[PDB]
Amino acid sequence: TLPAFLPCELKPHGLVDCNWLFLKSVPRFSCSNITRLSLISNRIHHLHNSDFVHLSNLRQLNLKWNCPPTGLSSCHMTIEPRTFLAMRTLEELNLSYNGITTVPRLPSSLVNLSLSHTNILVLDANSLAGLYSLRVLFMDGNCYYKNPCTGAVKVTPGALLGLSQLTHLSLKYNNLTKVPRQLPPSLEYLLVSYNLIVKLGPEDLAQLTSLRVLDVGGNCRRCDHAPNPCIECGQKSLHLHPETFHHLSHLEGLVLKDSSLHTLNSSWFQGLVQLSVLDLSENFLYESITHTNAFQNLTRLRKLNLSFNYRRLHLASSFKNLVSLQELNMNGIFFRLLNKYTLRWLADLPKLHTLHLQMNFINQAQLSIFGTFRALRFVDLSDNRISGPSTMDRCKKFTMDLSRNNLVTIKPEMFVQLSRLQCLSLSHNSIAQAVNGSQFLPLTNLQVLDLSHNKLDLYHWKSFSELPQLQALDLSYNSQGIGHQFSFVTHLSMLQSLSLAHNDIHTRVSSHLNSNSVRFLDFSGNGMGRMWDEGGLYLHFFQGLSGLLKLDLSQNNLHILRPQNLDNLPKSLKLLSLRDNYLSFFNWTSLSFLPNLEVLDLAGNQLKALTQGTLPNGTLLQKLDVSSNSIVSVVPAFFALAVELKEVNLSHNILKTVDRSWFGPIVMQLTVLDVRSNPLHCACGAAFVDLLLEVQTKVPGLANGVKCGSPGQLQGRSIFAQDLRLC
DNA sequence: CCTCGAGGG
Ligand SMILES: *[C@@H]1O[C@H](CO)[C@@H](O)[C@H](O)[C@H]1NC(C)=O
DSSP states (O other), X not given: OOOTTTTSEEETTTEEEOTTSOOSXXXXXXXXXXXXXXXXXXXXXXXXXXXXXXXXXOSEEEOTTSBOSXXXXXXXXXXXXXXXXXXXXXXEEEOOSBOOSSOOOOOTTOOEEEOTTSOOOEEOTTTTTTOTTOOEEEOOOSSBTTBOOSSOOEEOTTTTTTOTTOOEEEOOSSOOSSXXXXXXXXXXXXXXXXXXXXXXXXXXXXXXXXXXXXXXXXXXXXXXXXXSOOOBOSSSSOEEOTTTTTTOTTOOEEEOOSSOOOSOOGGGGTTOTTOOEEEOTTSSOTTGGGTXXXXXXXXXXXXXXXXXXXOOOOXXXXXXXXXXXXXXXXXXXXXXXXXXXXXXXXXTOTXXXXXXXXXXXXXXXXXXXXXXXXXXXXXXXXXXXOOSSOOOXXXXXXXXXXXXXXXXXXXXXXXXXXXXXXXXXXXXXXXXXXXXXXXXXXXXXXXXXXXXXXXXBOOOTTTTTTOTTOOEEEOTTOOOOOSOBTGGGGGOTTOOEEEOTTOOOOTTBOSOOOBSSOOEEEOTTSOHHHHHTSXXXXXTTTTTBTTOOEEEOTTSOOSOOXXXXXXXXXXXXXXXXXXXXXXXXXXXXXXXXXXXXXXXXXXXXXXXXXXXXXXXXXXXXXXXXXXXXXXXXXXXXXXXXXXXXXXXXXXXXXXXXXXXXXXXXXXXXXXXXXXXXXXXXXXXXXXXXXXXXXXXXXXXXXXXXXXXXXSTTXXXXXXXXXXXXXX
């Protein structure tokens, strides 16, 4: 009757969630059917032979973050010999972020193991005894600046050969000077990044002929302008032996990032015939990518990262061979100019769909080039310094992001040959301009336009009229004696979504917003309280938006909401958000003025009670959110008439109980009833317990998150800390 | 390998 696994939550697939519960011991709670137990981030510092005896059938166990090394502000975990042996079908185990110095004894059933961020500094053949079914082993971060050790962690030669089935090995951030010797040949991937492996040769990868991904990056770093502690490389560059990767016939992925690579050598990729991913970021290949020939035979290369390579830029002719290339990252390279030659050799690549060009300080750009490519779907030029022509965004659609640039004026010529663009972002520029229908002529196909965080003045009624396919327009956070603000809206014939959120609404703001197409309007963070206080002037401000379905009036300083104003909102309205206003009183029967309303959000107001009316017949209301108010009481039968009521959020209020007289029969059709963060009074007779237990599947966090506000020793603790059914 | 140089897995 009480949920079975207090103080934890039962979740469907045999999962018992005991996360973040301040537990100091493994809970005891039949348990013969639980197969998964998560105990993430509790306070368990000691583990004992008998601690898992009741969970003999566990397959998955997460003990992450129970006894962190430092860490935080220092913990050592003790584990008895037979602790995990009681679970002889245990398949997965996470011991990461625990102060253990040796790996515990484990059952041979184990398949996945994490020992990351512990204090295990030695792995020998004894450490992993009998893990012959192990496929996954992670142990990162046991000897770096956040989890320091003296010297390095040692993996002895052949220590892991017993792991006959090991496909996955990660040993990052462990101060390794060399790749461990005689690693299991079954390895399909090996991560040894961010150690001190300054030298690499075919010897170091001897017999790893089953590798699909190898990460040897960050082993020779340059620590100039490194935010966190960095160990500067002893040499000019990662020393790479030409034949190192030659035998890696199945290598699909290779990352050589942050290796201080000054040149590329085609030898490296010679034997890599299924190489689909290559990461070359954070090196010094600026000149190299401008001239090299290494790319000439990488014909299966799908993804390529060239980001943050330091010293007129032109991608080398070798790029023309990358006919499988789908994605190219060129962030943070820094080139002043983007021209017709800069990216020339990418133009005929059959399936190049994504191009990252962030943070390059580009101040002159012939964007026209992006109309010549074969299948560009996304070009990110955000955070550059583009100021003009050359001399809702999802869209996940030919898309271009020009946000955080230097546009002050938009000129139609900057968009020549970009006529195929369906999504554009000019957000976070400094565009102060009278928009008037003469800015985006070539953008004939533009459906989504983000002009947020700019300084547009929108008095002109011809605004955006040259965008015939415009469906979604974001004018959020816009800062403005002729024309009228927002007058253009009615003339945008296919506009479905519009945001005018957090704007500067001045005297001659159009008293009417009109449309036949707008279905969603975000009018958040404006002054609708101040506007509706000006009498009849704005009484019908939204009425002209025919077919309007969703309206957001959050953060509009609404202190009152008269029936006049609700009645003159479009009768089509299905969703209305009044979140974070100052509503103290509200006749709930006034909701009958919103016939088709289904979702109502009134959170962050000061409705001290649900007392003033009832949910009217025969409303179609489905979701009511009245959280973070100050509700201290509700009238019986309040929710009774809302036939279609499914979700109601009463959380973060001041309810001393939750009574069934409120809902009646509809309490059993409720999919969600959220009553957390109410100061419930947990006397020994309290009736709310049996009620919540009746709809327990439908109240989130009931097991431990629904807590008492009184009496004093129960203050801040769950309604199940003591059994309240006793009295 | 991936997401948002460290962390995840
Ligand atoms: C109820 O509202 C609270 C307000 O903070 C929110 O945290 C929670 O997500 C909501 N509950 C549900 C089930 O959506």
